[PDB]
Design a binder for this molecule. Structure first.
Ligand SMILES: [Mg+2]
Ligand SMILES: [Mg+2]
Ligand SMILES: [Mg+2]
Ligand SMILES: [Mg+2]
Ligand SMILES: [Mg+2]
Ligand SMILES: [Mg+2]
Ligand SMILES: [Mg+2]
Ligand SMILES: [Mg+2]
Ligand SMILES: [Mg+2]
Ligand SMILES: [Mg+2]
Ligand SMILES: [Mg+2]
Ligand SMILES: [Mg+2]
Ligand SMILES: [Mg+2]
Ligand SMILES: [Mg+2]
Ligand SMILES: [Mg+2]
Ligand SMILES: [Mg+2]
Ligand SMILES: [Mg+2]
Ligand SMILES: [Mg+2]
Ligand SMILES: [Mg+2]
Ligand SMILES: [Mg+2]
Ligand SMILES: [Mg+2]
Ligand SMILES: [Mg+2]
Ligand SMILES: [Mg+2]
Ligand SMILES: [Mg+2]
Ligand SMILES: [Mg+2]
Ligand SMILES: [Mg+2]
Ligand SMILES: [Mg+2]
Ligand SMILES: [Mg+2]
Ligand SMILES: [Mg+2]
Ligand SMILES: [Mg+2]
Ligand SMILES: [Mg+2]
Ligand SMILES: [Mg+2]
Ligand SMILES: [Mg+2]
Ligand SMILES: [Mg+2]
Lengths: 200, 95, 113, 85
RNA sequence: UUCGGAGAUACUCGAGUGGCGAACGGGUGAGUAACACGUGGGUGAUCUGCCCUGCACUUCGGGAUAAGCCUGGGAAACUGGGUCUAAUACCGGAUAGGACCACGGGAUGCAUGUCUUGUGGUGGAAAGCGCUUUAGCGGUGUGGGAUGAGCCCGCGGCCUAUCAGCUUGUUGGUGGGGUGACGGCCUACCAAGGCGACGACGGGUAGCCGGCCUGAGAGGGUGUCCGGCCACACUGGGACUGAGAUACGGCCCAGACUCCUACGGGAGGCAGCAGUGGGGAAUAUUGCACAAUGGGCGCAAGCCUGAUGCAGCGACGCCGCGUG
RNA sequence: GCUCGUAGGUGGUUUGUCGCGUUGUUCGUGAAAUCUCACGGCUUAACUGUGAGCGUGCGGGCGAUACGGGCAGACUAGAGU
């Protein structure tokens, strides 16, 4: 299942703008509802729950799928908040966002889900594909001369492309150099509170 | 017509029995001696070395063993209902 | 008596197999006496490995292979070097060596520059 | 019975029982006759009924009626009764 | 050649004899607190069909029987008698050391001994069939492997002392008997022992394990799918056949319960796969296929296989994706 | 309530020795599956294959003797006369 609801409503509760730029946010940066402007009680469980909610609705990942990401983030060496954002970033719909082939996160999910992309010449239609090192992310030969794909051509300059992937020319195909460590990950969220949420 | 008619056996190394050393508690069983073994072993949970004893019945071809008698044994074929050991030799007898 | 047989241990639509030495009075996935090989009949040629110094021990001592394992020991050549046939070399063939994952990535960087 | 081969085998388990019982009873009335001559202290018939009792045991062991280690255990016992008389 | 009967001579084949299989596979957890299981040993105390390999051999005869045919009894299930015919069925001889007994050598040790050799005295086997004319499959005695299995022992895993004296074939010895094998396993006499507060004897409960769930670990609960082992096949006992038997779809007897009967007597055992009734909070289709893999027989083609491979059904669980 | 004492648990200083406990190392074993790691194959994942760990143990051979213990002695501080 997907959320399929209002997107500003879960950017107002978390007090943090989740999608890239929003005018409905910053007119009302307080949580929604009829009791929207009230003084909230700053608990410790609230700081740990809402920080996990920043990570789910930024990426569009349900709870029984986000929990399995934690079950292998704590089990790999290194840290836990590092490798949690590493395996969340390598989802293929998040690759289409960072490569500048989509406007928001919810259309980068459809363009993978409706089957507009290959990887190694293999037709994928799952958003939760985890790209490894040296993967090419190619677009289908049929899906050129298409309206949402030609709008991603001239608009390849307004958002920064991270250093862990590379976009090339007239073939809009994405080359994955390595899995990103920390620095080229965009930060609306702190990472140690998601690790402390599941410790309860 | 060319083979040797007796293939020799593949040489199997002779497996050994167990040998233990105990005292003698009973002798009045007419060619049967009774040996009290001892054994020390860790407890599975508390880690203390626990001393436990057994009683085994061994075989005498000649009834010469008093009460005392550091003995030495070696386990055998079933010689009776409960006899499984034999007296090999006696060292520093009943003093 | 002693047989050399296959053991089905894959998924539902992926019948993996192991070449295993067992008694005839035993179910398929019972205790093998010794596992000596494997056979994956889903790749484009096949994926066949026989240990070839343990398959010579069991054939010399009396293990009768079953009729689909007999076709495998003729292919790898372990049957012909036991009965003394002139097809003693292995006539098995492996899959086509694909260009590796690093090679395609360096081919794509040079394709743009 | 129910299976077709099981009616076949019931008819052959009884042919084999009447066959083997006649052979085993011939061994018991030939070991016993040796025990008469051995207990009387004869040494005349006991030296030559041993040669005909052991020969009946080996024929009963080749016919599958008794096992070969059973024939060896009965010939060793009758021969050690001869050597002590 | 009647126009719907004759001709085994003849590939093919019902019933029948004979070989092998049927002790595997599949199900269930009632019983068992035990060498049942886990683990590591012992077997100088043993067995092992079919398979592989080394060496010898495959030799003379004999009497019957099922079927067939003719008949008697019975309501049936089934069964008695007379004639008649074979074999790789059966029985009796000749020759063949790993059967036995006595006396010796040579090697080794772990006390009984064990393996290897020699002499004398006693003994044990079998079977043929097929052939487009380098089709081919078998038979028997034995040395040695491989696999499977039996038996014994160390240590390990429940609650209860408001169960404290249990045991007389019980503990040990000798002479016999028995067994594949050691052994009170059995028997006759002789000795008076054996176990126990480190829980004997008794009562309650329970199939055991790899594993599964939880936990920071140590521990605690559990034994369901899958895989190993054990136990049982309507209840209780018992042998038989065979290399191998808790003999699930075998035999005999007794008991309970269904069913047939002409009242004399007979028949049956889903804890195999589906399925019905019942109990219950609650658990499914009287499905397809021998294509794949494993097994049985056959030289083989093949035949057999509710093992198995699959499908049907239930959100019952995990995983993935949609409803923009 | 308090002492006495049976089985049991525990033991001062020191010399020598055996190597049972302990400890080092090596071969046999600890089936496969499950489990953790690393890659590979089903469009991903569950699932599945391969390689390595794991299997806390137990048996056989060869090293060590500080400590515990067994054996054969010595000593006077504890204990008794
Ligand atoms: Mg889900
Ligand atoms: Mg005795
Ligand atoms: Mg038949
Ligand atoms: Mg008579
Ligand atoms: Mg005897
Ligand atoms: Mg026929
Ligand atoms: Mg045959
Ligand atoms: Mg059975
Ligand atoms: Mg005739
Ligand atoms: Mg003769
Ligand atoms: Mg003959
Ligand atoms: Mg008596
Ligand atoms: Mg005796
Ligand atoms: Mg006796
Ligand atoms: Mg029960
Ligand atoms: Mg805790
Ligand atoms: Mg079970
Ligand atoms: Mg069940
Ligand atoms: Mg019933
Ligand atoms: Mg028998
Ligand atoms: Mg049966
Ligand atoms: Mg039945
Ligand atoms: Mg049923
Ligand atoms: Mg009801
Ligand atoms: Mg089939
Ligand atoms: Mg087959
Ligand atoms: Mg479903
Ligand atoms: Mg429901
Ligand atoms: Mg002491
Ligand atoms: Mg001290
Ligand atoms: Mg394992
Ligand atoms: Mg992958
Ligand atoms: Mg796996
Ligand atoms: Mg060791």
């Amino acid at each position: 299942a997907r959320y399929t609801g209002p997107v500003t409503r879960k950017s107002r509760r978390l007090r943090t703008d989740l999608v890239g730029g929003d005018q409905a946010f910053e007119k009302r940066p307080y949580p929604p509802g009829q009791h929207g402007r009230a003084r909230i009680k700053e608990s410790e469980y609230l700081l740990q729950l809402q920080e996990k909610q920043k990570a789910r609705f930024t990426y569009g990942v349900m709870e029984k799928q986000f929990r399995r990401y934690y079950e292998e983030a704590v089990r790999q060496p290194g840290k836990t908040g590092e490798e949690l954002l590493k395996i969340l970033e390598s989802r293929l719909d998040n690759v289409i966002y960072r490569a500048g082939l989509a406007r928001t996160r919810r259309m980068a999910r459809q363009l993978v889900s409706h089957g507009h992309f290959n990887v190694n010449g293999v037709h994928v239609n799952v958003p939760s594909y985890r790209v490894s090192q040296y993967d090419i992310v190619d677009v289908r030969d049929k899906s050129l001369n298409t309206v949402p794909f030609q709008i991603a051509r001239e608009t390849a300059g307004e958002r920064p492309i991270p250093s862990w992937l590379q976009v090339v020319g007239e073939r809009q195909r994405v080359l994955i150099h390595q899995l990103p460590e920390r620095a080229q990950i965009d930060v609306p969220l702190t990472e140690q509170l998601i690790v402390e949420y599941y410790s309860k | 017509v060319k083979g040797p008619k007796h293939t020799p056996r593949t040489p199997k190394p002779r497996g050994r029995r167990k040998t233990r050393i105990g005292y003698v508690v009973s002798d009045k069983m007419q060619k049967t001696i009774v040996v009290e073994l001892e054994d020390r072993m860790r407890h599975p949970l508390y880690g203390k070395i626990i001393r436990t004893t057994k009683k085994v019945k061994a075989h005498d071809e000649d009834s010469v063993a008093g009460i005392g008698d550091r003995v030495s044994l070696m386990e055998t074929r079933p010689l009776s209902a409960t006899k499984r050991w034999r007296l090999v030799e006696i060292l520093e007898k009943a003093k | 008596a002693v047989k050399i047989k296959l053991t089905r241990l894959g998924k539902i639509r992926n019948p993996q197999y192991r070449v295993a030495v067992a008694d005839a009075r035993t179910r398929r996935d019972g205790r093998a006496i010794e596992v000596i090989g494997r056979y994956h009949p889903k790749e484009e040629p096949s994926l066949i490995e026989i240990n070839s110094e343990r398959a010579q021990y069991w054939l010399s001592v009396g293990a009768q292979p079953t009729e689909p394992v007999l076709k495998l020991l003729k292919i790898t050549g372990d049957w012909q070097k036991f009965k003394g046939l002139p097809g003693a070399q292995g006539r098995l063939k492996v899959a086509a060596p694909k260009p590796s994952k690093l090679e395609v990535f360096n081919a794509a960087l040079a394709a743009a520059d | 019975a129910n299976i077709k081969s099981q009616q076949k085998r019931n008819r052959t388990n009884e042919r084999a029982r009447l066959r083997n019982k006649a052979v085993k009873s011939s061994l018991r009335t030939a070991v016993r006759a040796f025990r008469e001559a051995a207990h009387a202290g004869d040494k005349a018939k006991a030296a030559e009924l041993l040669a005909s009792t052991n020969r009946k045991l080996d024929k009963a062991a080749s016919k599958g009626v008794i096992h070969k280690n059973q024939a060896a255990n009965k010939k060793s016992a009758l021969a050690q009764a001869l050597n002590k008389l």
